[PDB]
Amino acid sequence: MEDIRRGMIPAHIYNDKEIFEREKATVFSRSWLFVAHESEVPQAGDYVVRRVLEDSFIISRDSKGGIRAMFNMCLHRGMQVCRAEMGNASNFRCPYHGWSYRNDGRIIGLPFHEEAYGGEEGFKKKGQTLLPAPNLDSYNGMIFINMDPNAESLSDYLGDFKFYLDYYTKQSESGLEVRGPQRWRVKANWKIGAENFAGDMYHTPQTHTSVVEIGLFRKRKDGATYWAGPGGGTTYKLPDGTFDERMQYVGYTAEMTDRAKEVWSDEQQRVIGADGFMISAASVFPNLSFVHNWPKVEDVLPFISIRLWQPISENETEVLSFFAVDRSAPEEFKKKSYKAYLMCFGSTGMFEQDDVENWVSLTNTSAGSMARRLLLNSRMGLLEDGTRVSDELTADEFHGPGTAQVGYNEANQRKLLEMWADYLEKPALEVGPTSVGT
Amino acid sequence: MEDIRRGMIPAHIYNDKEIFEREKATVFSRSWLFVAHESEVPQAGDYVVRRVLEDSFIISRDSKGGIRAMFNMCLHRGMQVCRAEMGNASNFRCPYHGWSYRNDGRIIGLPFHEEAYGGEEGFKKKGQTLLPAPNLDSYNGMIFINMDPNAESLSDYLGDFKFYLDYYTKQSESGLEVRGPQRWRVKANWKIGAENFAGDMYHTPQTHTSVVEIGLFRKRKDGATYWAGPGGGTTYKLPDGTFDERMQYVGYTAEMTDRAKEVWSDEQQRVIGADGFMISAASVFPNLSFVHNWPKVEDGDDVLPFISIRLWQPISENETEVLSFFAVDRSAPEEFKKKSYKAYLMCFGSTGMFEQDDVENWVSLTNTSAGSMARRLLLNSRMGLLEDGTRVSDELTADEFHGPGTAQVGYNEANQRKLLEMWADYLEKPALEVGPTSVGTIRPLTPTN
Amino acid sequence: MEDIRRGMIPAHIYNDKEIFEREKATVFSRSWLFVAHESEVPQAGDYVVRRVLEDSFIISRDSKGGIRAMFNMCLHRGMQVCRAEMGNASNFRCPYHGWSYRNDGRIIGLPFHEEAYGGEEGFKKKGQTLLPAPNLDSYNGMIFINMDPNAESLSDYLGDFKFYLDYYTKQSESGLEVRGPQRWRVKANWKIGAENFAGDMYHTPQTHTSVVEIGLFRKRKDGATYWAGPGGGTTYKLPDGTFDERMQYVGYTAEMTDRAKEVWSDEQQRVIGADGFMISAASVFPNLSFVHNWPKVEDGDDVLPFISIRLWQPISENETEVLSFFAVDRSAPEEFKKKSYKAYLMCFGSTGMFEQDDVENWVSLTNTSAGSMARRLLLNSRMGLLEDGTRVSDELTADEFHGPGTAQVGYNEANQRKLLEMWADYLEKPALEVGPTSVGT
Amino acid sequence: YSEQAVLGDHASRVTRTGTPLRFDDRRHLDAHQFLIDEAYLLDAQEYQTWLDNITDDIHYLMPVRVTTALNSGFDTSPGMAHFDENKYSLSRRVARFVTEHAWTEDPPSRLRHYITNIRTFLTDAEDHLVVESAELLFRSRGDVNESALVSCGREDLLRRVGDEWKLARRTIFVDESVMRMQNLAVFL
Amino acid sequence: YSEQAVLGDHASRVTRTGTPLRFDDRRHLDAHQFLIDEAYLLDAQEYQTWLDNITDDIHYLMPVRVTTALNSGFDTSPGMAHFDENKYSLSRRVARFVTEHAWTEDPPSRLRHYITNIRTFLTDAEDHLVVESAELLFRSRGDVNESALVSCGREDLLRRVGDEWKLARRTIFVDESVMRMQNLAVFL
Amino acid sequence: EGSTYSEQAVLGDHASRVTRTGTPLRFDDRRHLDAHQFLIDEAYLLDAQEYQTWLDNITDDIHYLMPVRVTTALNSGFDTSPGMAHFDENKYSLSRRVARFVTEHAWTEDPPSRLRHYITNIRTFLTDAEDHLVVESAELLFRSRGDVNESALVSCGREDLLRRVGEWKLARRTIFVDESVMRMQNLAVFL
């Protein structure tokens, strides 16, 4: 605990029942956790059911274009009011006793309310709804739930990181289009993936040779790793060039590049234009992750992926992998982008395949009693006396907020675990019980 | 906990590991829990093996007609002494070392007792038996086990409820015939089914439309719900008529109706006869349930009744094994039995078209109980109570209802409330504590059918 | 707990989560636990991966003939550095970030050590290795790991039991040959199996009649059961004869009998030769067991012996993974090894016809230990003791028995009692505490 | 089993004769083609179509299995089945799904009836085959729970009716004592 | 499904006609023979041999299945598949295993593609069959974890090219919403 | 030592050395049809546990072998425990195993399991000897016993040698078990 603050990681944290139980009452009870994107429910009545651990939420679009999240639970005796993953409905009938709800949450049918309950005085039906998520918010159409009714806002949480998030999720005034997710279960602790994507450039050469060798791609250490607010990420150094040349060198068409400049600040442009750093992977604490890459086409073309590390146990995660692309991108661009997506990340991704082998194998060592005796070293970038190996990038070298460096390092992992430890020491969230029907 | 006593239910009680462990040490350590019916072991040497949670018991019939329950364990080094679900044997050999036991429990073979143990001073063989259940008893041939060796008697426990239990299980001086069980695993808390059968009329229209729509059935709110002692139940209001008319209207033959009158008291008759309430579902605390229904018959528009007895055996906080039985009066015509069973198969149990949908509801409620939201919700079970605690409708009077306990008409949640009040009373009892038996340092049960 | 000390066994100990969690921090944190034989990795670069519970260890032979155990973990971020069960390699590449290790454990490649870590001041590479097991030792080529860094030596531990162990594991100056294991999960508590092999003769007639009846074998009570140090065992009484007559009556060849006399002591010989006790089954605390039997051979009416070493690896309070090995002297005739193995396969292991029925017994007992009745029962393990604590029969004299420790004849439960006595002694030990290693310092 | 079933009085008593036919025997090939077409029907939950390949005197039976000792001379729950159906009951079961108010199967399961080990017999009546198969049903529903296997053997009686074979008897030997599925709102 | 797939524009549009062929029909016997030989190839991870049995215009597709309500008119994630492959991508996938630097499959899984329920259809084009099969993949790797099942149905388009049948389209209906396997570094 | 598994098997010295030639037969070829009919009839015998009947379909020089599988690196040149098998049987051992069941004193199988040998993926080859076929199959065994434990799967592949004697019979069986660590209480069955 004092060890994590020194970049030394107790080995047993990736496979310990007690730490998982604790995480659930701290990390996952107090954080903004992703569930869905707006673009997945475009029409009125459209809905997805998505989970925050084991709690089931309906995220649906109402008939004024607004978006709601409702705890997936009939108000009577708790049956799930919606047992499909997604679909389109203007209402949800409960089959247990036939209470019905508009898709904005408002109750409609409550049979024999008068004769049985004794009207309002027996049960409150006037202006009732399916329970709202404890806290709901979004950014760039990305919808988050927080289980703490007193959390700060999403914007406040994300802080300076919104600057980076924008590269992945706001490339046009049109908004984002996300599809999926592919969903599969892996025997790896939720944290290991979060860390990897946070700032693991080091692994890429070794883990992913198979993918260079097969000629799928066209200086790795030259990339910047940045951290700002509660998230951080990796980037690639691009050859010299202007904003447009560099955007184009990576696979963006000209009109896409032009649309990007409408929504990105001068400051957000300079990171690509002057500094020459293009987003690669990123994590947001705790379990949200992004990857952006541009393989060779069957020229190169970029794809984006958004993914949730949904924790099942101390040693099991559900990966929810999404494809995303800007909505105004050419239809041909969308198809090629998705093709690269399928081939690189997700349930069939040839990168992910090997990444998950690494993580799964780590989780295995964390299982034993040896693990409860090792601190692993995550201090790359730091000397024994605490002095930095290399220097912070200056404001001339790097124009984005937070702190940045070049070279292989373990700064980001160290900060993610630092957040993990600050959260693990918070007191248990306490919330007064709701009495449904009062 | 104070919340339950107000009819507000902490959502997490249906999927919580700690509450399950607690239940195990209270509810399932102190209650009469059903294992079998006598009619399942009619001849000498007949036996079923049945489980109180994870404890295995041989229920066998001796060669004098009497019934024994024996913990399914060899007295030497603990191997189960009978590894089948049922069969017929006049003794059980343990294959580890070859100790052998008559089917009434008494030890026969103990190899090298004299040479190896050193006789009686080494190990006590004289008059040893397989271990008796801690407590064993029965009523109308339904055999219960209770793990508390100082429990009250079954009859004391069941109290006034036996009045209603007789409708389901004593229709003649001949006794009952129960067959089964069908056994399958569901991911639903044991409690939800028990509460459903205890007094959920409200569900029936919605959950079971499919079954009406397909014309398998020939005023639901008009039924009475009743509670006496540790159990409660649902009933159907029947058209005006006498005892014979109303029994007949539901599918009993006339000689069946007559045989019933031989065993039911004037009061038990009057509830059907005068009050016009025919048993439907019922639960007995904690995990025993009944259902009695009369669907339309295959070749025509007559109706014919069937009975099911079921145990909700709890596996975890979020799993149950349903043990569904069929039951019919032993003196019923052979043609009546076949049709009654046919209806049973279609309606309840492993292939039941009602049960299918009921189990959906329960499994789905167990699902919401899993999460952290459910630890912050009190579900409402106050139907029949206003906010100031006054009743919505009135008790039925003695003129309107001739059976013991209390009863109302209308959809309500009084019986669920009373089932959960019991659960709570049990959950606060101290851990049962029992001195350990040092193996080596049974009263036949009279038939009741 | 006091109950065990009187030979009365709380039935719940074979299916209790809490007792398992406890066993793990005591028994399995402080015992010498078997992982492998030398003969399983004869060449340089040969390796098996074996487990102490959930801890994975590479056992490999270096290019000087020596043997090492290495925690199966790359020194950077945790990835297992060898994901196969066995093989031959001179080094192990970690696929996460490409650190590589010589098969003796010494790190070789550490990419960008200079540029990215800042050399030795950032991370210690000079003379780093894959982490050694907390404690490693061996005896007769049988390699054990102990999780306690301050354990006594394997020899101090085994004590007088080495005397019996030798019959199974040192029949020649050549050494032992062991093959396997067959591996399969059973739903029985690790403890039951160990007890059985430790001192259960009583079971044999009943459990294994099937195997007598099908004519697979050519006075059971006449066998001796012995206990010495942390182990004990069972034996068969042979007919009158000399050491060579008795060894041969059991299927050993004359030249194998002769090679035995080169490595057994006069005393070790006298137990077979004069006392006429030949090893059957044995256990070493907590989870190591042996069996030695001589069924009839296929084509006729001779008999030929087989040896099995097995590890009861615990998975939970109610699950064990049996690792069954076949073992035979390296110098036995090639025809002999084939027959011995054949008898092995038919008798014990994943297809053993003895083991089938033994495991049934143990699994059944695990079943009753699950319920709430089991937390109210003391099973009786007192056979050989009367009610006032006096012995049923007498100890064998030094004249009747020449091996160390104590012995008797007849069916008894003395060895089960001592095993469980040991179990209780270990359960009461304090939790092993060990300072954390900071890898890279 | 069809003779011991409580509701099996009206069931066909035709039984097998000879050894199994060769796998190129036309009659074997028809029987096989039939079981595979059923499978695709039961997967797509086309219960009406399925029901039209069932004779009006069908006995469709799946007893409860119980673990018993070797010489006990039975291995089913006396007088208790999972399924003991005639055409009338089978059709009312199907009628129920057709309503689309069978909640436990809306949303539907995902089913895969694997059919293997098919072998055919001549019988002691004219236009009748006995067909043995093994069937393994894999079933997944929703996005949380693990999938379920149901293993079984079946003996079927096929009957020639026009240019078509139909199912006159099915006895299902379920390979479990305690079922591990939520329900049997499927067909085997 | 092939038509709804994002990358299905170039895919063959041939579809079945008529009712299934008899099981002694030569064209069925060929289709069956093909699918069992594929299985042997996919078990042994002979991905190169396998890849030579696949036409140059292959569409190989396995959409993500999602549990939905009965009258929703779709049961797959709109615009998202597990596999959506042409010949290029399938070969680059196999090329990857060929490097022996695909870490997640060294050591290799142990694979068993069970194939059952095979049936064959004439198509609306000359040298083309449609073949339905059910495939149950069993997979084990290492010495700790339990094995995984994958259950699925397949529709294939085989095409005649010389004296040899080849795979022109594959649509895989997977029987799970959420996959319970570490990866899909295999083929179906 | 050899390069079949049968040749590497410790007790495989007396085993028939006949091997496959050609590609697989067509599925209407008489010899294939026979092979198929054989393996399915076996399956029904092994389900019913008719081990005496089953044994009469097994030549007197049978080698019945199922080696232990072990997970190994890609170019290690092996994937079975050197010199260790689950089953390595001749006719004598196989019959003595069956004899055991026949005594009715094989306690671990009284009561009996419930067995379903699923056989699929059958394909046949001509050999380099006269009255001999090579038959590959996949066999999935489903097994359930009692009323508490979940059921077990066992997945494997088989290479068989069939031999004409009047009827076809089993002369060689090599079982490739798909698990390293088995998950079954025992192998008191046959594959």
Ligand code: FES
């Ligand atoms: S639970 Fe939904 S209406 Fe009762």
Ligand code: FES
């Ligand atoms: S445990 Fe049954 S006789 Fe020994």
Ligand code: FES
């Ligand atoms: S974990 Fe081995 S190189 Fe990083």
Ligand SMILES: [Fe+2]
């Ligand atoms: Fe990666």
Ligand SMILES: [Fe+2]
């Ligand atoms: Fe109901």
Ligand SMILES: [Fe+2]
């Ligand atoms: Fe034994």
